[model samples]
Target chain A: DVLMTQTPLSLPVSLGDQASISCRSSQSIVHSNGNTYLEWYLQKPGQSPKLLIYKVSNRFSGVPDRFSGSGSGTDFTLKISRVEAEDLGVYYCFQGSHVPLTFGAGTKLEIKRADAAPTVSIFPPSSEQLTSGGASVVCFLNNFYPKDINVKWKIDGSERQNGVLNSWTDQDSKDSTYSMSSTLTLTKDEYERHNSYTCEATHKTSTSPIVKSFNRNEC
Target chain B: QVTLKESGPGILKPSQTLSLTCSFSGFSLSTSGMGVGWIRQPSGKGLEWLAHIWWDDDKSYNPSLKSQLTISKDAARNQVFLRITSVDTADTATYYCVRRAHTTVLGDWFAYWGQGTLVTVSAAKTTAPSVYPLAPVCGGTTGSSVTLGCLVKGYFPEPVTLTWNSGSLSSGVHTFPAVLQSGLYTLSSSVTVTSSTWPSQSITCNVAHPASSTKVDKKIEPR
Candidate 1:
């Protein structure tokens, strides 16, 4: 069997940007006709794939000039210079030189919006006391961009080193951006502080770091 | 308890129809047994289950291909017939006939299979290549100059050549390797421009696939 290996689980390309995929065969695909029987195709969403390249680098009729192909023998390439909205799909490479003609497993290309500053909101503790007997405060940041969020606590307006911070990033399989949450924990004394406390989120995607002040009154 | 064998033509010209037969032994094609169906895989492409008929005379098919296929049975001859109309290079693949291990719902597994028969669609000019270009974009930075990306999508044929032209400075055109999106292919080339050192001029990316007599251009004016 002629195995075709491709790279990149998926490409998250910004609009009007460029994206590409590669396919390599295990065996030489050069046929006797001076033409490498290698070819390329694009399988659009919910649609059958249409042939893009054939006989090594020959474009099929009706295909645009921007879609180009390269490489020979075992190494093959398929490229889209500037990606369009409709270009989102799975690309494949095929070899017809050998019987049972084989195709590369496949590579996927996905469209993505440019990064935007994420919104953040922190949740305060329901009460000053916890089941464990300490005044515990929790802060939450949602839909944060670039996944990097930092939080801190203040005791009477002073930074407190005893506060514990927990942060995690989450992303959907189809989304190009990541969401994150950061939680800050405080002790009874810290929660009872007379100064205002706030959660700060720092990310490059944001024009300015976001700050959410704790609304829970000191006990 | 049963055996299956598939037979079909070795090759045909483009647009010609394809005919196939699956003969069985020791198994019944009627409601007394499980279901039977056809599945095909193109070279390097994924598997596409074409059509299937249940033991209770129920039939299901791949929605996209049902319009192109015709399935029937010749029980007396111990054979099942499969036909694809207006076959093109896309229809080229090995077709296999399989038998269900049980009923529909939770029992659609193929317990028996037939040696698949290959169908080749020989076409000199069947599919076409794709080409397009896009405006240059900045990487969200402020500097003396910016990097211009020329975009291309869904092109076909191989051995593609790309060139870049910038007025102010001699630019080195770097092309990214090709990658697959969905089922097509894409590649890109970029050139950096120096705002102060370089003069205000047009920037463009040109590409050519050996099979087509066209040059793809991605160009934009100084901004």
Candidate 2:
């Protein structure tokens, strides 16, 4: 097994800024007769790691192109382009072509602040209801100000009268950033009847309102 | 549209044995002549390949699985069964049934896999004694520095170590560290040694375990 290690040099700017990390293998992984097996992973703060790259350069299924891995043999790099707010947390690398596998100690990715204001970004931007028993929505709010924000859930432009709104805050650096996920539990009939739902983030220093909408049947 | 399911006991006492069967539908076991293999995954861990049995009656077991492996097929039931005796906590893994590619042979890669089932092995029994069925054989030419490599997959908690030995010219072992991705473990290590004795010398790769019985060894001769 060859060891790979990485360290983040700087904090990421905004939520979607490309966060770059470096991975170095203990030995040249270029097999004289085989493919170089290197990969990258992202472990969101407090969450299990997720595969970001495989075979050194190929992206896993459903992975965004923004998360790309390059480099070969002993030196490798993972770049998350247009990094969304959801990309906060740690990144790691693993080599596949060897035995007794190894991983790079992860690099923590924090949000960088411009002046005093934080940045917020959304991913996928839209979602659809599968069966409608309950709808869970997540919003990516990165590099923001005052570290205080609230997320609300609304259906058909009306307050979710009977649903509970839940949100969580995560801070990776001086930049105030967080991710909020709201679960709106409703009777199956109401969930089926609602045409649309909205996840809105409210903060004090917002230049423009940030809102993401989802249709009941459209993803 | 073929689906296979593996059913077996969920827990095994240390040094106890595990038995599992893979049942299939929509495919004929005897007529297809397809190969069958087994894989395992520990709780929240990656998948590890255990062993494979081919239509032509060839079998290869993971060195890690050799001591406790027993594989057999039931042509009439379209099923294959696996039994691993003298298990331990590290043996806790989800077991799966797989269909091999038609072109499978020695050195050929695997292409298909089955949904995995979980199995957990715990303490309460004594560890089995370790065995290295095959002694290591040196490869390459005499007086020439050669690099050795080994591949281990479907195991967890990486950084597995390797050891090499030769009757009169022991080569120092080098353990290359590895990584885990999507439940797969891979690593390779090489040491430069003068093959002064040529064909008569042996080089072996073994994964050390706390349990006296859970070690695997492979011997290769230099061309």
Candidate 3:
């Protein structure tokens, strides 16, 4: 089997939680090569979250102002002064302190307040003709946070998880948060005559599931 | 290994006193050189330290619960008992009797713990979550979707644990905020889907209650 390293998990996963990067009480762990590359990183979207934060507790050059590194092999703490929409994706910590570059599994960071729930809207094609025309439906998930979203579609108790033709994010420039859209295509029969095409979103906000159903409308 | 077990009724009314007993096994009550603490977590939330009683007989508590919280030990039974007055919905949480080694090193963080007992302080007391079957009503066509409602109501110590299909479909089950009426609680889980989805199909509504220890479920199709 091929040997390799994995990234580290993110901090304070949900919204309203202060992101904390804690590395506590480890021996000097100085590498045999006599160098300790123990540091943090955030790989952005197209990439991941920050990949490196502090090298043994010092911000690397070019790191943003929001990021701060503190503590020691004596219990290191790396923190983002505050969280914003801009900081999305996974966080990782690599222990160059050891061999295999000790890359721990990554942390996916998305923010959703306990009360930050999203509302949904569905847009269907103009064709009312069944079966003959392959129609499409687009579901809009609005006003969500930290950017972790689950959009799914199901038909007649059967789930079509990857059935969506396309899903995209549209940022609300004024606030900086985002909205998600999922589009699915189906035979006019499946789109109009169905009783169960369900779309839903799960987030840290909202006490219960945010739901919308496509059938049994006050028929 | 000091064994800790928490005991208390699953229900309580607003202003009612919440009393929990933490009984132990394989450890002495008066002297284990350790500390026993009462920690609680809200449903779907994080942990909150409520109060602590050191084996040394000294005590400390969270300021918020201090006035109404009283913690004591019964040296005779090797147990600790907690009593909080004027309990409310916010007090609905899982309470655990956590044991800390009282070590001078690495901060006094919790190390070993006991299984938590859920003590729900609610609008009133009842046997269990009075769950009704799924009431599916389909008025298919001429619109977007049909709606199905799972109305769970009337029990005290209101359990907000909602679910759908062994919890796999929980995210799609819309849970409406609970309403209080006549000293009881009322809530519903609804799902909207296409005409074919219901298919005279049945959805299940389950009510799990430690009040009696078994959950009941039933499903019904729309008219």
Candidate 4:
């Protein structure tokens, strides 16, 4: 049995910085037949860990060519070059050839910004409400730490100019964690007709945008 | 994107049942197309494929794990649980919960894995290591007695039996000089068999152990 260990609980890096994660095995993974079975994965903050490499260094199917794995025997590394804004999250390593396979704890890659700004994350952009011809959409920004911020609605990448956008931020008295929500109303027909509509929420210093398009017929 | 965490007991006595769970967050379990699977690793060994749940469509298990494996899902909590019965020392290892790719054509290869939790098994620990024996290589002249020897290593003190099958020894065979060395045991067999098509046939060597339900057999093709 090989023991695998990873270092650096969390790594904070600015966008474009190179990131690397190490996986060490207790014994030489090179089998008598000469094959090393090690793999690497990346789990964006809220997403599942995606397989990046396997068989020590071979890229898994469909993985971006930018991601590369190297090293053999007991030492291995997974490196990502020219990191992007979407690369913020944790990374892990796994051993495929050993029993009781194991994974490294993970290293969270945080983006360091110069000024405080509101951050927003959106998912499942295609929702069922967009089919009713009149739908009210809500986006949640959990733990919106800053108090003074404004949320807005827009269609087709342009400022709504007339639609309403509300912002609310609440804090937990016990833990000091804050919660916030933003809502927008739009006609389902407008959402369906537009190919580039988006909900852009702005605050005093930062703005986070979410893009969505309707394709009910395709669904 | 859904993330899963695996939790379970760290150790189990032989004959005891093993149980574990994979709790998930950020995704609805009710949605069709999600796949979940389990894999294990002995304390210092390679990953072994276990079983998988295809969300009401079908389920598949490794033949080695079939007798001791059970898998079920709870929709409300988005969790899948595993239970293995009649555990043995060989079953000790860390177990992982993973989600399979939803897209077709990936087959059963896992793309995502949960941080594995370790499990150790104790009781009736074997003093001898398990060994697999290779078939013997033999070359003989026509109408002459030829002896073939095969070596089985790693397993200790266990009685091993050798059986001859159709092929090179089609006329029949006999065993002799059964000996053990270190952790390995060797058995030699001879036969006065002759054949013109011997190169096209296979002679099988089988080793039966007391602990195993069946014999470990190896076949040798004449060339």
Candidate 5:
């Protein structure tokens, strides 16, 4: 397996600025024909991926000259001379010289926006609790950027110990933002004894952790 | 905004030809000057690049499948089609349609992928039998008796017969129901024997299935 390693998983760039991503392969990507089999693609927000550069540096048909690819053999680079609003998305590098074609772990190019903040909400347990008289509270973190966030559940003043389930972060196809959910389940005895359940979510775009609480008696 | 959806039959028979269509929207092959390709994953295996058609109708295919593969496009419907003749169980997989960038100098890479469609090839009567022994359990008191287990897996059309070679194993046999997984069947059987008799004599589990002409045997002793 040819391992394609990408760098700067998260790149924060301002409009009109330049952005570059590194894609290094574990082995030389030169085919027996002497041509390096490397390509670059960019997947803009809510859009299918587009070919920016192919064969190391050749631009695809109608591709803008702003995007360029360089280097050879084991190390390669993709540079965008001037970043535009439409260029703010994930970039991936691929190698086609091996039998098992491989792709680099994507690097996301991010821009600061007001809507990048996640909308956090906490829901109390419903009537359909577990058969053992246990109930669960759910916390949803939606519409975040860069796919980096931390979530935790706390009871009163202490962190939760058991029955904590976190979902994998998924990109929303409509807007290309990330969303995830975390759940905390409590035994009947514990649920009745404690009424304060807290859900905290932290994101790079936020000034501090977003906190939401659910009270058993209030609901 | 480009979107792709793959369509094809869910099941197939051995030696039958396979056909698949990828209906797409938000982009045009002729207008954008891009190509569409086919890639597949066989159950838990890695991705396999199959064939593709460039915007100008140029074609490229995996050399291993060049003889039997064809990739074509429908200009009116904005769709790409893939066909493979004489497909077997090895061709049963989740086939995906993807947009690719191709050039003779740079080669190619798949960018966007469609939600793939799974194609299952119905079990043939002649699939080779894959028989092996699982971890055998040494049960009972240390000096009383021991139980040995064997597993017959990755076979088609179940109801396999089993026999033991040891004479002491007359009725202490337990055969489990066949389990279906990833288009294959698995079965397990065990026999109990006296601990004193197990250390010195090797016991063989004979498996007979419709796929294999001869009986497949797995022998296990102390280990």
Candidate 6:
């Protein structure tokens, strides 16, 4: 694998602002065939990572003109002439000139926060869903941005780690925000403790984790 | 722009309490709907999150340090404090204070960070990097071009310098950054040369590491 070093690990920009990222390869990226196998990608929140510029500076299909790339050999650059609200995300530079292709440590493109924080809600096990006195509680986190988040469960102030399933982060196609759900299952012996179970969702752009509590008594 | 600065004693004894103070401007510890946190990178290692505290008095800590770590802030002073009791050589690292910006519409992110302060324990261990050339891989065009690869691994202390001894034929050489795995680092370097050239000359990969006084040079030629 080759090394593609990226600079300005964290970039904070505003809407309509211009942004630039640098990627320097440890060695020459020029192939003996004369083609530079370098590409740039932008991973928007809640979506698959998409290509922006490939083969050095050629804009990928459907990419906006505001985004451009330049550089050759060991050094390369990616620039956005005008950052849009939807342009905020992580950027990565990749090299394929050598075997075991490598990627640069991604750059986080932080645009001023324009989206809303997540809303957290937890549901207690329904009577029909309860099995042999065991319960499965679901926690939903909705309307968040940046996709990166952590969903954790706490039982009476203690962490609940086992018997958990988390859904993939899904984007709201209409608004582009993100949502996810996590489920925690408890056995009869564990749920009988009568302690409170809290679902906490921590979003990358929110200051504090949103929490919701549930219990058999409350249900 | 937000500025965060972290300060602490540059040296510490094993089993002593590690204290670091983070002072900042452009946001208040109590008003910005933001959080302050500590991240550390040990010598020749990856980053580890120590702890974080929000303006609302909410806090989270790394499970490994949960019992001995305390993270708090003084709004009046606009400073956050990190204290880890009974620290060891493993705690020797560069500590950075970061600002966690809160967005009503997005998730939390570290929007600002300090330059980082390195604190060292009494001493740190070291390991020398190893360098070896892989078997030559022949390519197309009657193997018109041959790619030579050098693998470097098992290094410590982060800084390793690699150079190529390609003599006059130095084009098409590439080196990669060192990646840590299980506490050691692995790196790859390669050079592409015409098959006609490989049979006429030899290439060498030189490795210089802080862990060793002597440098390593691995040379290979057409077989």
Number of clashing pairs, model 1? 48
**A114-161 in candidate 2: lDDT tens per residue?**
434433221211112223233333333444554557766677898664
TM-score of each candidate structure, all chains considered together:
0.33, 0.37, 0.45, 0.34, 0.50, 0.41
The parts of candidate 6 lying over 4 Å away from their true place are A1-219, B7-20, B26-35, B38-51, B54-68, B74-78, B84-96, B100-111, B115-124, B135-142, B166-171, B180-182
Runs in model 5 with CA error above 4 Å?
A45-47, A113-121, A127-134, A140-147, A155-181, A185-196, A202-219, B1-5, B9-19, B22-37, B40-223
Best by TM-score: 5
The residue-by-residue lDDT of candidate 3 on B149-212, one tens digit each, is: 4555455445556666556445334555454544665555555566565645556666565554
Q: Give per-residue CA lDDT, model 5, range A1-219, as digits (tens).
A: 688888987787767998889999999989998778798877664444566787899997778999899997899999999998778778888888875667787788876434487766566554334343656566666667867888888888688867776554434444657666565656778788987888998888877889977566765
Candidate 5 lDDT, tens digit per residue, B1-223? 7788999988779888899999998777885457888877665344567887878888878778888899999977999999999888889788989976555532255546887888977755545455554322223334465656555555775557777774346455555555454466656555667767775777888888864664777776443
Point out where model 2 deviates above 4 Å.
A1-34, A37-54, A60-63, A77-79, A82-219, B1-4, B23-41, B44-61, B70-81, B96-115, B123-223
Clashes of each: 48, 34, 49, 15, 0, 16
Across all models, the iRMS values in order are 18.8, 27.1, 15.5, 32.5, 19.3, 25.1
In the range A106-167, model 3's lDDT, one tens digit per residue, is 45555443334665654433322123355544555665664667777766767776536433
Give lDDT: candidate 6, residue A18.
Answer: 91
**DockQ, 0 to 1 scale, candidate 4:** 0.02
Interface RMSD of 6: 25.1
Better model by lDDT: candidate 3 vs candidate 4: 3
Question: How much is the lDDT of residue B106 in candidate 4?
Answer: 36
Evaluated at residue B48, the lDDT of candidate 2 is 55
Reference contacts preserved by each model? 0.01, 0.00, 0.03, 0.05, 0.05, 0.00
How high is the lDDT of residue A86 in model 5?
A: 77
Candidate 6 docks at the CAPRI level of incorrect
Query: Could you arrange the candidates by lDDT from highest to lowest?
Result: 5, 6, 1, 3, 2, 4
